[PDB]
Curated annotation (Swiss-Prot):
Reaction(s) the record says it catalyses: RNA(n) + a ribonucleoside 5'-triphosphate = RNA(n+1) + diphosphate
Self-association state and partner proteins as the record states: Homooligomer. Interacts with non-structural protein 5A. Interacts with host VAPB. Interacts with host PRK2/PKN2. Interacts with host HNRNPA1 and SEPT6; these interactions facilitate the viral replication. Part of the replication complex composed of NS2, NS3, NS4A, NS4B, NS5A and the RNA-directed RNA polymerase embedded in an ER-derived membranous web.
PTMs per UniProt: The N-terminus is phosphorylated by host PRK2/PKN2.
Cofactor note: Binds 2 magnesium ion that constitute a dinuclear catalytic metal center.
Effect of D314H: Complete loss of RdRp activity
Description of how activity is regulated: Activity is up-regulated by PRK2/PKN2-mediated phosphorylation.
Name listed for the protein in its UniProt record: RNA-directed RNA polymerase
Result when mutating D220 to G/N: Complete loss of RdRp activity
Modified residues (Phosphoserine): S29, S42
Residue span(s) of domain RdRp catalytic: 209-327
Natural source organism: Hepatitis C virus genotype 1b (isolate BK) (HCV)
Lineage: Viruses, Riboviria, Orthornavirae, Kitrinoviricota, Flasuviricetes
Complete-protein stretch covered: 2421 to 2981 of 3010
Function: RNA-dependent RNA polymerase that performs primer-template recognition and RNA synthesis during viral replication. Initiates RNA transcription/replication at a flavin adenine dinucleotide (FAD), resulting in a 5'- FAD cap on viral RNAs. In this way, recognition of viral 5' RNA by host pattern recognition receptors can be bypassed, thereby evading activation of antiviral pathways.
């Protein structure tokens, strides 16, 4: 029961790949230690192939089936609708990979007759054929990291026509079912503000709180055929149109369970029998399966008063402590159970008794003070990776502007405000690109966002205090300064100086640019303004935001 089998054909690139950090006239203003930053390339795909390839054994017990039964009960309450071809098309990102059958993403988005004709013929084939494996492409991802080198992650995805069909059959399901089945434990429903609030309240709810994150080693490759059939049975609990049921059976049999793996040059690379990382159901499937296995493992480990927070395979548990030594033993049994369920650990879970020492979705809780001196909890992270990616993005336009994603989700943090906002607004002013819409990915979905709308977006996800936090914690200040020394990033005093300039330059522009000056950089001046609610923030359609996760799912808003 191997996760993959291979032919020896290489996982090839589409385009030229750079691994070394590109340097331009802006690079040194952000980061001097250039040799510490690299991008992954297809050249490391062979090592990843080794890592993701292993035998899965699964031992399923009554705790597993009990939880599953409970999950299906909740799933039966869901009604989902089929999308029209045209609805599905409009959810397609403008730069999504083109079909093999003579059309591309902009063809799909424009409802070009050729595209829509192909999609109708794909749909009809799903309805008629529930057996034939569907072809997928396997590609190496190019992502940027700091040293101390990771091999490239793999992405496996079916043809554009199929992807539109997935949307038609399952978009409403994957959008609505996770929150119904998992309620408050479903992470992708929450803005950052809502997530910190859930974490802090959950911690406070316990008499003696203990918490841990569980890291599954290569979660996608631990997902078995059983797991994928169980996912399908959950989806099938929904109130669905007859064509939707047939299409979901067909996609499950022909695509989700497994299939052939073709490189960008058309050569067969092998065969997958685990989760495809690049399908509509990757996030929803991962979340449900992670939740099922973890909920049953909690019961196996007799952890008391378990509260879970699950975003795909990212799992945090907060529960009642039994003292340190017993907690350690309980975690060992939790892991044993997970392992029997085919989700063994990368790093062994560590129990934590301070909420701020728990990392989940790569973030920890920390504390600052708002304008009134009130303590405010917010989410932050070690800024090394964000800054290494910012440095790549200073010299190269990328399909995913991670800095924008980071300014949005980590707006309240010391490092996003002082460094990211300052640096990137300086660049945008110089190139007259304040108004130019840019793509970023939040909870796996693509969003086209104009930088001038940042203040309103930040207000809506975080509140006005995002523009007012001060008196950050010693350990957080210390982590940021340390990171800046490691990377050769100028110290925070330099950034304050530049922000004052950027702020002025922005106010000179007037209008929405001045509003950016006023809100984003009020921390940089000594005569602070009073920041009042933004009129445009009440008008923003932030629907689409924080309903669900869609990593690998080819979704655009
Ligand atoms: C303040 C704050 C900051 C973050 C950091 N972020 C993430 O972790 C993801 C994320 N996107 S995803 O859906 O691709 C995904 C994420 C996290 C874990 C996981 C996944 C997706 N999966 S999967 C492949 O199983 O769906 C693995 C687990 C994000 O979009 C943001 C980011 C913009 C800064 C990157 C998160 C919540 C939050 F409140």
């Amino acid at each position: 029961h191997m996760s993959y089998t291979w032919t020896g054909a290489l996982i090839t690139p589409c385009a030229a790949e750079e691994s070394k950090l590109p340097i331009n006239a802006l690079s040194n203003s952000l980061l001097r230690h250039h040799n510490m930053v690299y991008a992954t390339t297809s050249r490391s795909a062979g090592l990843r192939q080794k890592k993701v390839t292993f035998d899965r054994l699964q031992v399923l017990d009554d705790h597993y089936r009990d939880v599953l039964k409970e999950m299906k009960a909740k799933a039966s309450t869901v009604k989902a609708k089929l999308l029209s071809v045209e609805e599905a098309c409009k959810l397609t990102p403008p730069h999504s990979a083109k079909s093999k059958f003579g059309y591309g993403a902009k063809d799909v988005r424009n409802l070009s007759s050729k595209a829509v004709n192909h999609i109708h013929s794909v749909w009809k084939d799903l309805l008629e054929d529930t057996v034939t494996p569907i072809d997928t492409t396997i590609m190496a991802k190019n992502e940027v990291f700091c040293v101390q080198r990771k091999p490239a992650r793999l992405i496996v995805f079916p043809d554009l026509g199929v992807r539109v069909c997935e949307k038609m059959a399952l978009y409403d399901v994957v959008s609505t079912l996770p929150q119904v089945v998992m309620g408050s434990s479903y992470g992708f429903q929450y803005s950052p503000g809502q997530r910190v609030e859930f974490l802090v309240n959950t911690w406070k709810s316990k008499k003696n709180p203990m918490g841990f994150s569980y890291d599954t080693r290569c979660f996608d490759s631990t997902v078995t055929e059983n797991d994928i059939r169980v996912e399908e049975s959950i989806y099938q609990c929904c109130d669905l149109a007859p064509e939707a049921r047939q299409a979901i059976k067909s996609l499950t049999e022909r695509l989700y369970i497994g299939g052939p793996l073709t490189n960008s040059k058309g050569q067969n690379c092998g065969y997958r029998r685990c989760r495809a990382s690049g399908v509509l159901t990757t996030s929803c499937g991962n979340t449900l399966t992670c939740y099922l296995k973890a909920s049953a493992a909690c019961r196996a480990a007799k952890l008391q008063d378990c509260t879970m927070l699950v975003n795909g395979d990212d799992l945090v548990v907060i529960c009642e402590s039994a003292g340190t030594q017993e907690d350690a033993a309980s975690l060992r049994v939790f892991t044993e159970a997970m392992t029997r369920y085919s989700a063994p650990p990368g790093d062994p879970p560590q129990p934590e008794y301070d909420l701020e020492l728990i990392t989940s979705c790569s973030s920890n809780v920390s504390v600052a003070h708002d304008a009134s001196g009130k303590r405010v909890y917010y989410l932050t992270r070690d800024p090394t990776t964000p800054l290494a990616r910012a440095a790549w993005e200073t010299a190269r336009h990328t399909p995913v502007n991670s800095w924008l994603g980071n300014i949005i989700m980590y707006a309240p943090t010391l490092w996003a405000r002082m460094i990211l906002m300052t640096h990137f607004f300086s660049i945008l002013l110089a190139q007259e690109q304040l108004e130019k819409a840019l793509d970023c990915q939040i909870y796996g979905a693509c969003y086209s966002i104009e930088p001038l709308d940042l203040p309103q977006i930040i207000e809506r996800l975080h509140g006005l205090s995002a523009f007012s936090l001060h008196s950050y914690s010693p350990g957080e200040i210390n982590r940021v300064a340390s990171c800046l020394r490691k990377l050769g990033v100028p110290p925070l005093r330099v950034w304050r100086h530049r922000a004052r300039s950027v702020r002025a330059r922005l106010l000179s522009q007037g209008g929405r640019a001045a509003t950016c000056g006023k809100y984003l950089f009020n921390w940089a001046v000594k005569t602070k303004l009073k920041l009042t609610p933004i009129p445009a923030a009440s008008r923003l359609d932030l629907s689409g935001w924080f309903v669900a996760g869609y990593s690998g799912g080819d979704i655009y808003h």
